[PDB]
Amino acid sequence: QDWETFQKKHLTDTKKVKCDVEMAKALFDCKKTNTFIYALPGRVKALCKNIRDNTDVLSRDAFLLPQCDRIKLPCHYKLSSSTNTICITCVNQLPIHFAGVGSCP
């Protein structure tokens, strides 16, 4: 919805985020599943430069993204990450939508 939040919730600053807080914080409220992307801002807004308005794009290889998974306890999650291409929508040059994991559906 906005490169800003899309940079706050869909992105983090480490491959091993603290899912415990990355979800129990305030913008989530301790949900059950969560996903984010491990990348630096310049490389993120850079992969959108030269692009057109709102269109469906996709990484050219793979990307390591951290992921929270709640399967036990009430407010606890497991750490799981992997490298794979991901489809996302970007505008004139700002990424704000997360299509899904791996290549487009």
Active site residues: 10, 97
Reduced to 3 states (helix: H, G, I; strand: E, B; else coil), residue 99 is strand
What number of other Cβ atoms are within 10 A of residue 35's Cβ? Answer: 19
The answer to whether 37 touches 83, Cβ cutoff 8 Å, is: no
Breaks in the chain (C–N beyond 2.5 Å) sit after none
